């Protein structure tokens, strides 16, 4: 194949995006290419062989906080692909992890495949549609060379975990829990773009700390770990085609 | 505004909800991918007197072959429809759950007052309210007076069934109706500043018993005629009006 020339990072919270924006001295896009009047934020730059763009759903017009979850993440994935036609999408962010699955706080995981835990449609074949099992782009050399942990990602639009959520997450044998990944995959799949995930563990879903409190306390230190790893992924991707990883 | 409405987009999640209306207005499936090439999305186009009518459906899932229901495809088709087709107003029309205790009956077509989510639980300050996603449908008082549709709040989530956690939030948010797309369509309509309204036809009573096969089939023809007929009368009413008039 031809060498990868353009990467787009999809990142749900600006705080998680910014250390990576610094590292590569990307600059904030000023011309609203994805749509006038949208709250979306885009940073762009060029690094050795690669165009680097990073897109965030930005702050909610009315409530002023990051617009997390499946819908905005899906919209910015769609709009950034149509506008920039990248070779690869990278969905990078924080997540819950399971101790029992070997997750530890600060671990930055590669994702093998992804599902949803909150799309329950008890009609045959709609049930499978709602789970939405999709494989990440095969990156074995990146996996091997960066020495990343890998596991299944389970997505839903809640930060806590209901009984039914827990039932499906366990049944799907997920290691990791988030609010955007499976939706990013859905759009990447829809538009035929290779997708890879970097999910940095901020809290242990099966541990003894409350989720909300642990996620918030560990956000800054884990974001920094995420930046470190994203930086190495960008450097590894540079000059490769998709077969090389 | 006061400019007369020239263009209406219908966002309809399942093709079985869309095809009766499509046939009623003799809309044609477009040949030339107006929303982007190589996608499973379906666009039906026609004109009915003063009005351009677009009906858009997320279509068949490429892996499982069934209708691409739920908030993600709905949000994506709405976004792309707004950008490509530049409508004056969006109508999200389809079937839903209803609460008999909020006055819903099978076959009722509701005009929706406002929309929320029930499955975006984010229990941290100000993200919690964001997860609620409370938005108002476009004010249409004349259409309501004319058509005498029941009205109520719609609660959206990605599951057809109802967990106890869901029920709790649905009750807390005081919803009459339950679906899997509405609040996601509204979110996008709001982002792009397009008036949005909702026609929601009650197919099942979330707080009533299972119908027999006989009932379910007979109810279905009723729900189908009710949705189609109500959407027809809505198009006819909009024609010749500006947004201020409804
Ligand atoms: C403020 S909502 C939580 C944000 O961080 C991620 N996150 C990390 C913790 C975690 C968890 N335990 N469950 C679900 N999402 C989580 C989500 O994908 C979302 O962008
Ligand atoms: C095949 S999933 C059901 C579809 O019909 C709608 N619908 C029907 C009733 C119903 C319900 N009781 N709960 C949630 N969505 C429902 C949804 O918005 C979705 O497009």
From Swiss-Prot, chain B:
SUPFAM superfamilies with a match to the protein in the record: Purine and uridine phosphorylases (SSF53167)
Pfam families per the UniProt record, alphabetical: PNP_UDP_1
GO biological process: L-methionine salvage from methylthioadenosine; nucleoside metabolic process; phloem or xylem histogenesis
Binding sites annotated in the UniProt record for S-methyl-5'-thioadenosine: 95, 178-181, 204
Binding-site positions, adenine: 178, 204
EC numbers for this chain: 3.2.2.16
Catalysed reactions listed for this entry: S-methyl-5'-thioadenosine + H2O = 5-(methylsulfanyl)-D-ribose + adenine
Statement: the UniProt record of this protein carries the keyword Transcription: no
Regulation of this protein's activity per its record: Inhibited by CBL3 in a calcium-dependent manner. Inhibited by 5'-methylthiotubercidin (MTT) and by formycin A (FMA).
CDD domains attached to this UniProt entry: MTAN
Gene3D superfamilies: Nucleoside phosphorylase domain
Alphabetical UniProt keywords: Amino-acid biosynthesis, Hydrolase, Methionine biosynthesis
Domain of life: Eukaryota
Disruption of the gene: reported phenotype: No visible phenotype under normal growth condition. Not able to grow with methylthioadenosine (MTA) as unique source of sulfur.
InterPro entries, sorted: MTAN (IPR044580), Nucleoside_phosphorylase_d (IPR000845), Nucleoside_phosphorylase_sf (IPR035994)
GO molecular function, one term: methylthioadenosine nucleosidase activity
Active site: 17 (proton acceptor), 204 (proton donor)
Gene Ontology CC annotation, any one: cytosol
Pathway membership: Amino-acid biosynthesis; L-methionine biosynthesis via salvage pathway; S-methyl-5-thio-alpha-D-ribose 1-phosphate from S-methyl-5'-thioadenosine (hydrolase route): step 1/2
pH dependence: Optimum pH is 8.0.
Tissue: Expressed in roots, leaves, stems, cauline leaves and flowers.
Subunit structure: Homodimer. Interacts with CBL3 in a calcium-dependent manner.
Entry's family note: Belongs to the PNP/UDP phosphorylase family. MtnN subfamily.
Role noted for this protein: Enzyme of the methionine cycle that catalyzes the irreversible cleavage of the glycosidic bond in 5'-methylthioadenosine (MTA) to adenine and 5'-methylthioribose. Contributes to the maintenance of AdoMet homeostasis and is required to sustain high rates of ethylene synthesis. Inactive towards S-adenosylhomocysteine (SAH/AdoHcy).
Protein name stated in the entry: 5'-methylthioadenosine nucleosidase
Species this chain originates from: Arabidopsis thaliana (Mouse-ear cress)
Classification lineage: Eukaryota, Viridiplantae, Streptophyta, Embryophyta, Tracheophyta
Gene: MTN1
């Amino acid at each position: 194949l031809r060498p990868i020339s353009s990467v787009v990072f999809v990142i749900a919270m600006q705080a998680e995006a910014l250390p990576l924006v610094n590292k590569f001295g990307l600059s904030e896009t000023t011309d609203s290419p994805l749509g006038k009047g949208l709250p979306w934020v885009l940073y762009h730059g060029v690094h050795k062989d690669l165009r680097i763009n990073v897109v965030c759903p930005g702050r909610d017009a009315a409530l002023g906080i990051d617009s997390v979850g499946t819908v905005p993440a899906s919209l910015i994935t769609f709009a950034s692909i149509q506008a920039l036609k990248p070779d690869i999408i990278i969905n990078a962010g924080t997540c819950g992890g399971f101790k029992v699955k070997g997750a530890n706080i600060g671990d930055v995981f590669l994702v093998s495949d992804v599902v949803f835990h909150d799309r329950r449609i008890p009609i045959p074949m709609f049930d499978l549609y709602g789970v939405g099992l999709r494989q990440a782009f095969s990156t074995p050399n990146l996996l091997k060379e960066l020495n990343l942990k890998i596991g299944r990602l389970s997505t839903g639009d809640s930060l806590d975990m209901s009984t039914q959520d827990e039932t499906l997450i366990i049944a799907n044998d997920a290691t990791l829990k988030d609010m955007e990944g499976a939706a990013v995959a859905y759009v990447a799949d829809l538009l035929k773009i290779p997708v890879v995930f970097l999910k940095a563990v901020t809290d242990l879903v099966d541990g003894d700390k409350p989720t909300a409190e642990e996620f918030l306390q560990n956000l800054t230190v884990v974001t920094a770990a995420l930046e470190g790893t994203a930086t190495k992924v960008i450097n590894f991707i540079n000059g490769r085609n998709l077969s090389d990883l």
